Write an enzyme that holds these catalytic residues in place. Sequence first.
Site, PDB file in Angstrom:
ATOM      1  N   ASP A   1    -102.049  93.810  28.255  1.00 62.24           N
ATOM      2  CA  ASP A   1    -103.039  94.787  28.691  1.00 62.24           C
ATOM      3  C   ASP A   1    -103.768  95.357  27.483  1.00 62.24           C
ATOM      4  O   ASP A   1    -103.153  95.595  26.445  1.00 62.24           O
ATOM      5  CB  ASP A   1    -102.407  95.926  29.491  1.00 62.24           C
ATOM      6  CG  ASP A   1    -103.452  96.869  30.078  1.00 62.24           C
ATOM      7  OD1 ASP A   1    -103.511  98.049  29.661  1.00 62.24           O
ATOM      8  OD2 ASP A   1    -104.227  96.426  30.950  1.00 62.24           O
TER       9      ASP A   1
ATOM     10  N   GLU B   1    -106.763  98.426  26.203  1.00 61.62           N
ATOM     11  CA  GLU B   1    -107.650  99.540  26.505  1.00 61.62           C
ATOM     12  C   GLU B   1    -108.753  99.445  25.471  1.00 61.62           C
ATOM     13  O   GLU B   1    -108.506  99.053  24.332  1.00 61.62           O
ATOM     14  CB  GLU B   1    -106.917 100.879  26.423  1.00 61.62           C
ATOM     15  CG  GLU B   1    -105.748 100.992  27.402  1.00 61.62           C
ATOM     16  CD  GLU B   1    -106.182 100.997  28.868  1.00 61.62           C
ATOM     17  OE1 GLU B   1    -105.321 100.740  29.734  1.00 61.62           O
ATOM     18  OE2 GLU B   1    -107.369 101.264  29.168  1.00 61.62           O
TER      19      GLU B   1
ATOM     20  N   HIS C   1    -103.623 104.985  31.793  1.00 64.08           N
ATOM     21  CA  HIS C   1    -104.545 104.600  30.731  1.00 64.08           C
ATOM     22  C   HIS C   1    -103.822 104.093  29.486  1.00 64.08           C
ATOM     23  O   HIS C   1    -104.443 103.855  28.451  1.00 64.08           O
ATOM     24  CB  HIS C   1    -105.486 105.765  30.393  1.00 64.08           C
ATOM     25  CG  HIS C   1    -106.231 106.293  31.581  1.00 64.08           C
ATOM     26  ND1 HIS C   1    -106.837 105.465  32.504  1.00 64.08           N
ATOM     27  CD2 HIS C   1    -106.455 107.560  32.007  1.00 64.08           C
ATOM     28  CE1 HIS C   1    -107.405 106.201  33.444  1.00 64.08           C
ATOM     29  NE2 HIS C   1    -107.192 107.476  33.164  1.00 64.08           N
TER      30      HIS C   1
ATOM     31  N   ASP D   1     -99.123 100.025  31.513  1.00 62.33           N
ATOM     32  CA  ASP D   1     -99.773  99.032  32.362  1.00 62.33           C
ATOM     33  C   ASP D   1     -99.156  97.659  32.178  1.00 62.33           C
ATOM     34  O   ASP D   1     -98.922  96.944  33.148  1.00 62.33           O
ATOM     35  CB  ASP D   1    -101.277  98.976  32.087  1.00 62.33           C
ATOM     36  CG  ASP D   1    -102.016 100.146  32.706  1.00 62.33           C
ATOM     37  OD1 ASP D   1    -101.490 100.723  33.681  1.00 62.33           O
ATOM     38  OD2 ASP D   1    -103.116 100.495  32.222  1.00 62.33           O
TER      39      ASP D   1
HETATM   40 MG   LIG Z   1    -106.123  96.670  32.455  1.00 63.66          MG
END
Ligand SMILES: [Mg+2]
EC number: 3.1.13.-
Lengths: 206, 207
Positions: free
Chosen positions: B16, B18, B174, B179
């Site tokens: 994942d 960000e 977030h 995640d």
């Molecule tokens: Mg994502």
Amino acid sequence: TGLCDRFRGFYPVVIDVETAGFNAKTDALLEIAAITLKMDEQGWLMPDTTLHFHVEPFVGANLQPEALAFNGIDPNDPDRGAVSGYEALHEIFKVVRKGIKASGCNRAIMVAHNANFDHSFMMAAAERASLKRNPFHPFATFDTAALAGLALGQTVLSKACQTAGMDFDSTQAHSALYDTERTAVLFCEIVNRWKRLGGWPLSAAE
Amino acid sequence: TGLCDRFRGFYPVVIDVETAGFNAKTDALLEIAAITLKMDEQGWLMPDTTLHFHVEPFVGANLQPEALAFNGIDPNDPDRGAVSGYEALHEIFKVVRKGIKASGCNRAIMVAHNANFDHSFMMAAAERASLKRNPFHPFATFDTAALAGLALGQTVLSKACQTAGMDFDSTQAHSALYDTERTAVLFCEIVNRWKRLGGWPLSAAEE
Ligand SMILES: [Mg+2]
Ligand SMILES: [Co+2]
Ligand SMILES: [Co+2]
Ligand SMILES: [Mg+2]
């Protein structure tokens, strides 16, 4: 057992494109086919409407020699019966919107093998044509390579179809219509096998 | 019951990111986490190694105000323990190559929720860092949105985890690490449920 109930209101539309290269921004779209799906009363998934088009390279498009040699397409051949991307996509969107309404869904989702590639080309063709109210979700897809990886332990289209007990004729592998049809049957077999083995509905296991 | 047998030699790695926006070419990578997977002797899939990084915005990076407001990240905060993209990815690639070798796979495949996004960003970051022999497949991914759509009839991460009977804490949504961990557990329970219902291996249905 309704189609709108199966994927939280997403209307799955199977798509395949053939192109004149790897760049969705700059390279020509050359073929596109689309297959809508339906569920019967018992909640089984099958193909519904089928569309297919030879597409004329957009004005200013790049065409990679290597790409044409790969897929065998000659966009200069006047007997290929091409239409504009606008005409092709406009017709697809019309059929898709009608299906969405009829089934009670809220948005279409692209089903495709290595879906990012096809999504990227379709969206860019949509933007070039300035089409309004694109029924497709702007970033979500159902990649059949990933689904087949799960269901069948295979990620290549031809091998996945074979493992699933389907025919796959490699002489037709560069045709968007053929690929789209095989991918639709593949997706349906994966969804249906899941249901048949008791994986869906979620209540069924008990 | 071997990991390398499961996905024709793809070594699945959950990722994942960000970011400071939607453009993989121009926007900063801000966080990245990675979780490798393993199978036990009975063929059950589970998390193996976990890695996570706060990433310093690359030189020349664009940062969208709206993106920072969305994910809550402030790249200018000197207490965020940021490292370079090079350092983050170099370490991830090292762990991944080692896993590939150890398990007898041929290449890594990214597992991610709406995987194209994460793939785009990771690939761009690898490219900025001039990393060689990227273990990851250049375009194949395992999108958990699509897999959850099939397995659970849901495409949104939090709803998918919930439907799967997993916890999901929205205050951690977030965070790349959180995640990634939820997505790893989700992917594993989807793969494992298919096996346990008798969908895998292919010969199970007739035994
Ligand atoms: Mg994502
Ligand atoms: Co066009
Ligand atoms: Co970077
Ligand atoms: Mg294709």
